[PDB]
């Protein structure tokens, strides 16, 4: 995967939630993106009230979409999701699996530094 879409949806019933995902994925495919899979994080109470499209939301559903897309089409996807009203907060980040966990050896102890002053009689 290359890009990850942290998608938060307004809490609603099963039919409209499926419809919202169906058209959101359709918008991604129109911009030239090959979506890998869709991950569902369930519905949870939002950490804080989020104001979007003249509404106050306290509960929402979380969904995650990962895809390969050209670099120039990220703005179009972000702009398209902003106009949509069934999505409360869209964010796009590079997929964390793109970077590899750098190998580590240990906590190297830093010795105290000497020779910071002259040796004259204080």
């Amino acid at each position: 995967p290359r890009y990850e879409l942290a998608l938060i949806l307004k809490a609603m019933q099963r039919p409209e939630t499926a419809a919202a995902l169906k058209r959101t994925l359709e918008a991604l495919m129109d911009r030239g993106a090959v979506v890998r899979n869709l991950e569902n994080l369930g519905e949870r109470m939002l950490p804080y009230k989020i104001s979007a499209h003249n509404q106050r939301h306290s509960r929402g559903g979380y969904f995650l979409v990962d895809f390969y897309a050209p670099a120039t089409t990220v703005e179009s996807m972000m702009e398209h999701l902003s106009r949509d009203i069934d999505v409360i907060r869209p964010n796009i980040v590079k997929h964390p699996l793109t970077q590899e966990v750098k190998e580590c050896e240990g906590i190297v102890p830093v010795p105290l530094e000497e020779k910071l002053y002259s040796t004259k009689k204080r």
């Binding site: 830093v110 910071l116 002053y117 004259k120 009689k121």
Partner: protein, 116 residues
């Protein structure tokens, strides 16, 4: 753990710009500073206020304020006792940490060596 002192001070062989600019050199002295006396605060306030309530409610006569008057005297004696005994005992009580005089002698036996 002690904060690292690596690449902080302004030195000739230091590519990193200075991060610390101490007023006086970071050299451990052979003596510790004296304890600072605790600043005082007004005592017997929660007992004086209730005493004033009875005086204003009874035309400044202690015919019915005896309960409040005695507590005000008790607080004054209680505050007097603690104030006139804190100084002597606190010098050697040490709260588990040696008084400044003992630490000065201990440090003199194992002094710091800036020279040689």
């Amino acid at each position: 753990a002690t904060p690292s002192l690596r690449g902080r001070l302004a030195r000739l062989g230091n590519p990193r710009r200075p991060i610390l600019k101490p007023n006086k050199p970071l050299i451990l002295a052979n003596h510790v500073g004296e304890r600072r006396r605790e600043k005082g605060e007004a005592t017997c306030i929660t007992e004086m206020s209730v005493m004033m309530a009875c005086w204003k409610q009874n035309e400044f006569r202690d015919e019915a304020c005896r309960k409040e008057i005695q507590d005000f005297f008790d607080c004054a004696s209680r505050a007097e006792a603690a104030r006139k005994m804190r100084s002597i005992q606190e010098n050697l009580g040490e709260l588990g940490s040696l008084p400044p005089k003992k630490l000065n002698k201990l440090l003199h036996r194992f002094p710091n060596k800036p020279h040689v």
